[PDB]
């Protein structure tokens, strides 16, 4: 927690002192009501409207206000930035623009207006670099749209008019050259608006331990409310009664404030441990959720595989001098800058000796991806090398006249079935072979997924890429299932399915198509290499950027469940014992005989109640240093662990009330405040 | 006189276990829907004639059947009491009750409370007693035993939806259990001196010149069923100390046994129906430790007694102020604890004349929910609510998932358990608060000081827990008190029965899982201690301020 986060938490606390936002926390709302009643009683006493001591009720109001403010602050840090934000998607949507095109054909002007001014039927014009304004269907021209927010694969896809590949989307950046879009959806519901609504609008549940502890809190609060409320008629029977300020203060003193603060003590301590294990967590519930997850959804491109589909092997044609194929590929993909071109260059250069030929000072001329012939390459002195897909090269070769072979057909087929993205190299004619582009799994993943299967965590592997590849990668990696060709809504529906059965889900993704799903999962680990949309939707960033960081996350989660258990024992015992240490001081006024029940010989009811509020405050503040310290994380039976908790924690909790209130009261009387 | 107290408690518990272990097998045959040995053709003809052809019931249908039977009985008993100057068997031409008194009596008997704000010798007329109050003793006792049958079936049935037929449960319980046992007990009592006749009141002329008029109702049958089904509704004003209801000491011992009979049998049966006897012996251990400690405390308090007696001229200070000379003070102490723990309500001594601690212990036993050998059927499912609560809390303090008898418990049951555990204390505290804030409510107290408040608290505590007994100094025959106590009794009873049926309906549809690391065994001294802690701490954390201004204030005075 660097400085700015503490000041932000302080402001969110003061802002959350509003009664309309405190209402969602029963115990702290009752302390809020009691604080308000006591400050009002103090004002009514100071003004002269009531008789009594105004500085004792002012001191109780002031300490109840400190208890509430620190409770809100601790809850701020633990769960203040745990929600799924869509700030990056909204920023792309708001700072967007595009150029209206009079005279729908290309030969016209370009009126740059915001992207909200467009409507169905308009004719927009985009060129290299610009972000496509909204949905539509290209009418003129063809280019390479970078549809990596939708699918996931960062390889440019060709969009052109006439055929089937003519539908563009809003947000995907164009790369190759111009195209004339005509919008197809009113500004209301685009794809970007759809997924901005999916990100914000997906709520994360509360774990079962939280609900159980909340039910226990509310039960104890009802018990103490009935007791201390009905105290007045019973005590007013026997002559003198119980004061009113004493009543409200006793009520807000007895209720379980330690248990209310335990959720934030474990939150902060869990986030600290996570950071220690190189994961930046933003939600404290995420750690205990990781403690008891049951499924693990996984992206393929970006998460498991490196995410850029490097080159693997060369596969020449009949007697085409494979060395020639490698030299051609190296000298051809030289000028390229995308990882695939540099990868071809590296593979050829480290698989053969061709250092001499690489230089950028030579007179050759590089033909970039034109999106009209669909093949890049180079032209050197009396040379012409072209790298491109199978069908683009087929057209080029057929147009020249050279009859296309037959070996390449089966060869590229085989490469595709292997689970790669075949290319072809051609030196003017006589295609020199195929160059498979398969994507490589990150590293030592099969072992870790075996560990995840042993721990009892199913391992799905969702994807946005074709089935051939999702199958091959699911085989090599060693996952259980896979779902190729899954748009973002598909991933989100899968998460809702899996977590509607009661079990918890832990998705780990990196891209912008994972943000819906990451925003709905319980443990949403976003790779540090992922987009900003992914990192904002998730609730813990993985600075190692390794899919198999969950095997350490679930360890720290199990340990935070042990800690939460022992601290729960301590809290319950502290509350049950503070009831006995406090309540004997509400009878001294009714019957003098009941002084015999004052076992600790506390000074007076007023001093006892002031000691109780001070102790409540100090205990919530000290609960966090207790969680940080932790416990011994040994594997124990249910009964042995219960008995150990009872002995150390439950009994320490029993003794802390009495000694703490007595010492606080001793300080009050010694200092003279009484 | 501590050897005598120890021997009395030892013999009581020993004979009780001996008698109740064999009956538990019968109740287990009933919970498994198996017909008893010789009653399987009689049963066929009787069910065909009544039109109860077997067809199971989910929890909604079961609950509605029980509530419908109870409401029909309530209407019948109300109107019967109002119009008892038209019905036969009325030797002394008594008139029909009031609307407030008839309402309170109907509600009390229908809900197994048997709270008495009248005098049976001069109010009811041999037909309200015979064809009203004792018919409701049988029916309320069987309704209570049937709800617990449904709950044990929910615990032992794997992935089903139906808890068995309710009408067949009522008929089996009543005919095969409650009528024969009650007949034998009644014949014994009549042999020892109790009454059974329909004669007019007898006109005696004392040895001296005085005159007497003895009441002569059919006392023994209602005595037998009242004790056996922990109803506790006396035939006369002095409940079970009248020489015509408790003639000797043998009848008193047999009544003490009868009260605790079916509770204990239901615990042995619960253990036997799961195939694991340890499960049942755990409940018997938890319940017995509390009962023995309470009995010892009450006995010591009474044997210390009234300090002023030995200074006014008497020869000993023992408290013999509200006790029959036919039973001792040890026996009256044991019976006070027995009746208040057992939710019976039959009193062998005046609880108002007990000392401060003497009176405090029964009251607290009533206020913790009557989960120590509690009412017939009611005690066991109350204790099961507390067992689910203890299992939840233990799961909480180990960090693992809760689990009882294999089935995993979820938060819907925790919500229902919390509401069920919190209904009775709210009625107690709220009703006592309203009673103490209105002149009408606090003009009934007979005694001054904190003992008046103790009277009011004990009365609403008894009504809210369906106990029935009272201090009896409270002149609680008025519209305010009748209506207040009727509301308390009704809401307590049925607002507890409903969540139990909900929990049973939610548990019957699960499936018992396998052992894990979150499964702590629910026997052995650890869980017994955890369960005792839960019960006593809830009770204290609620009733300590209320008991510090009543019994403790007077004791420390």
């Amino acid at each position: 927690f660097e400085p700015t986060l503490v000041v932000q938490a302080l402001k969110e606390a003061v802002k959350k002192l509003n009664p309309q936002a405190q209402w969602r926390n029963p115990v702290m709302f009752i302390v809020w009501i009691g604080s308000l009643l006591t400050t009002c009683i103090s004002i009514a006493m100071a003004s002269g409207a009531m008789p009594g001591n105004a500085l004792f009720s002012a001191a109780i109001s002031g300490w109840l206000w400190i208890t509430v403010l620190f409770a809100n602050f601790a809850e701020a840090l633990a769960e203040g930035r745990s929600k799924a934000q869509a700030n990056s998607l909204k920023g792309v949507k708001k700072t967007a623009f595009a150029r209206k095109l009079r005279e729908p054909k290309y030969g016209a002007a370009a009126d740059k207006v915001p992207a909200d001014q467009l409507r169905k039927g308009d004719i927009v014009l985009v060129e290299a670099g610009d972000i496509i304004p909204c949905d539509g269907e290209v009418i003129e021209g063809g280019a390479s749209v970078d549809e990596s927010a939708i699918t996931g694969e960062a390889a440019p896809v060709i969009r052109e008019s006439g055929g089937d590949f003519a539908s563009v989307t809003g947000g995907t950046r164009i790369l190759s050259d111009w195209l004339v879009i005509e919008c197809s959806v009113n500004p209301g519901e685009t794809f970007l608006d759809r997924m901005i609504a999916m990100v914000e609008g997906a709520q994360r549940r509360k774990t079962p331990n939280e609900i159980a502890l909340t039910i226990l809190l509310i039960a104890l609060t009802i018990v103490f409310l009935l007791a201390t409320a009905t105290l007045w008629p019973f005590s007013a029977w026997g002559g003198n009664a119980v004061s009113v300020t004493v009543l409200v203060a006793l009520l807000v003193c007895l209720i379980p404030t330690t248990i209310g603060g335990l959720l934030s003590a474990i939150g902060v301590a869990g986030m600290s441990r996570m950071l220690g294990a190189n994961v930046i967590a933003t939600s404290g519930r995420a750690v205990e959720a990781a403690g008891d997850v049951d499924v693990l959804l996984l992206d393929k491109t970006g998460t498991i595989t490196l995410g850029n589909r490097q080159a693997s092997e060369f596969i020449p044609a009949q007697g085409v001098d494979e060395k020639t194929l490698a030299d051609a590929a190296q000298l051809a993909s030289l000028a390229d800058e995308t990882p695939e071109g540099r990868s071809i260059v590296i593979l050829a250069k480290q698989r053969f000796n061709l250092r001499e030929r690489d230089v950028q000072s030579l007179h050759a001329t590089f033909v970039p991806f034109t999106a009209q012939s669909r093949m890049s390459g180079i032209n050197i002195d009396n040379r012409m090398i072209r790298k491109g897909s199978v069908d683009a090269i087929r057209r080029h070769v057929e147009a020249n006249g050279g009859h296309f072979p037959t070996d390449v057909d089966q060869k590229v087929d085989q490469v595709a079935r292997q689970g790669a993205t075949p290319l072809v190299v051609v030196e003017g004619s006589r295609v020199l072979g195929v160059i498979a582009l398969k994507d490589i799994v990150k590293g030592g993943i099969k072992e870790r997924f075996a560990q995840l299967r042993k721990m009892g965590i199913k391992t799905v592997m969702i994807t946005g890429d074709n089935r051939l590849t999702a199958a091959a990668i699911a085989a090599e990696a060693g996952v259980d299932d896979f779902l190729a060709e899954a748009t973002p809504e598909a991933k989100l529906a899968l998460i809702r399915q899996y977590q509607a059965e009661g079990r918890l889900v832990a998705m780990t993704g990196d891209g912008t198509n994972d943000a819906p799903a990451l925003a709905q999962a319980d443990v949403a680990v976003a790779m540090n290499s992922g987009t900003q949309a992914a990192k904002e939707a998730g609730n813990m960033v993985d600075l190692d950027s390794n899919p198999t960081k969950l095997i350490e996350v679930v360890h720290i989660g199990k340990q935070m469940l042990m800690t939460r258990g022992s601290l729960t024992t301590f809290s319950i015992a502290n509350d049950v014992a503070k009831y006995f240490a406090i309540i004997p001081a509400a009878f001294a006024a009714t019957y003098p005989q009941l002084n015999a029940l004052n076992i600790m010989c506390l000074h007076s009811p007023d001093s006892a109640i002031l000691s109780a509020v001070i102790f409540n405050a100090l205990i919530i503040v000290f609960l966090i240093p207790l969680a940080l310290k932790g416990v011994s994380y040994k594997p124990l039976t249910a009964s042995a662990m219960l008995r150990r908790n009872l002995w150390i924690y439950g009994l320490g909790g029993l003794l802390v009330p009495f000694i703490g209130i007595k010492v606080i009261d001793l300080l009050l009387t010694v200092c003279g405040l009484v | 006189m501590a050897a005598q107290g120890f021997l009395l408690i030892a013999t009581f518990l020993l004979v009780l276990m001996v008698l109740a272990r064999p009956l538990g097998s019968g109740l287990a045959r009933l919970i498994n829907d198996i017909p008893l040995p010789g009653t399987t053709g009689v049963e066929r003809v009787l069910f065909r004639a009544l039109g109860v052809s077997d067809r199971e019931m989910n929890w909604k249908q079961y609950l509605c059947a029980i509530l419908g039977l109870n409401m029909l009985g309530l209407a019948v008993l109300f109107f019967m009491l109002l119009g008892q100057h038209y019905l036969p068997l009325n030797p002394q031409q008594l008139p029909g009750l009031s609307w407030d008194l008839a309402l309170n009596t109907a509600v009390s008997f229908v809900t197994n409370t048997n709270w008495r704000s009248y005098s049976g010798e001069t109010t009811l007329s041999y037909f309200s007693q015979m064809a009203g109050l004792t018919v409701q003793n049988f029916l309320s006792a069987a309704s209570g035993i049937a709800v617990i049958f449904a709950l044990i079936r929910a615990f032992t049935r794997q992935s089903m939806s139906t808890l068995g037929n309710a009408w067949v449960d009522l008929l089996r319980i009543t005919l095969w259990v409650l009528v024969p046992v009650a007949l034998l007990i009644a014949l014994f009592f009549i042999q020892q001196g109790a009454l059974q006749n329909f004669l007019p009141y007898q006109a005696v002329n004392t040895v001296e010149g005085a005159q007497q008029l003895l009441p002569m109702g059919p006392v023994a049958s209602q005595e037998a069923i009242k004790m056996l089904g922990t109803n506790g509704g006396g035939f006369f004003n002095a409940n079970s100390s009248h020489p015509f209801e408790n003639p000797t000491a043998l009848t008193n011992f047999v009544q003490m046994l009868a009260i605790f009979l079916i509770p204990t049998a239901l615990c042995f049966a619960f253990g036997e129906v799961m195939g694991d006897r340890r499960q049942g012996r755990m409940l018997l251990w938890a319940m017995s430790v509390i009962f023995v400690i309470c009995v010892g405390v009450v006995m010591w308090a009474e044997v210390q007694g009234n300090p002023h007696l030995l200074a006014l001229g008497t020869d000993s200070s023992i408290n013999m102020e509200g006790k029959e000379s036919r039973f001792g003070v040890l026996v009256s102490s044991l019976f006070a604890v027995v009746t208040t723990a057992a939710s019976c309500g039959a009193v062998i001594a005046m609880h108002d004349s007990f000392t401060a601690l003497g009176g405090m212990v029964p009251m607290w036993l009533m206020q913790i929910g009557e989960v120590v050998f509690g009412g017939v059927g009611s005690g066991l499912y109350g204790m099961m609510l507390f067992v689910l609560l203890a299992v939840f809390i233990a799961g909480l303090m180990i960090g693992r998932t809760p689990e009882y008898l294999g089935k995993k418990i979820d938060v819907r049951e925790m919500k229902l358990t919390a509401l069920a555990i919190l209904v009775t204390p709210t009625l107690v505290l709220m009703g006592a608060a309203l009673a103490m804030m209105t002149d009408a409510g606090r003009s009934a107290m007979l005694n001054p000081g904190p003992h008046g408040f103790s009277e009011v608290l004990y009365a609403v505590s008894s009504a809210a827990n369906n106990n029935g007994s009272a201090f009896a100094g409270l002149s609680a025959n008025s519209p305010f008190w009748n209506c207040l106590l009727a509301f308390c009794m009704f809401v307590g009873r049925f607002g507890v029965i409903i969540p139990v049926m909900a929990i049973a309906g939610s548990l019957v549809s699960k499936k018992s899982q396998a052992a894990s690391s979150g499964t702590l065994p629910t026997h052995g001294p650890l869980f017994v201690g955890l369960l005792i802690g839960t019960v006593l701490l809830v009770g204290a954390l609620t009733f300590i301020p209320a008991l510090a201004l009543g019994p403790v204030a007077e004791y420390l005075s």
Binding site: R24, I218, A219, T221, I222, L225, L226 | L419, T426
Partner: peptide, 29 residues
């Protein structure tokens, strides 16, 4: 009846209703 006692009874009943409603909807709260 008075002003103080009536206000106190109203407040206690509101708090009890709020707590029982928060106990039935434990997930939201």
């Amino acid at each position: 009846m008075s002003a103080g006692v009536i206000t106190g009874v109203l407040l206690v009943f509101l708090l009890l209703g709020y707590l029982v409603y928060a106990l039935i909807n434990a997930e939201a709260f």
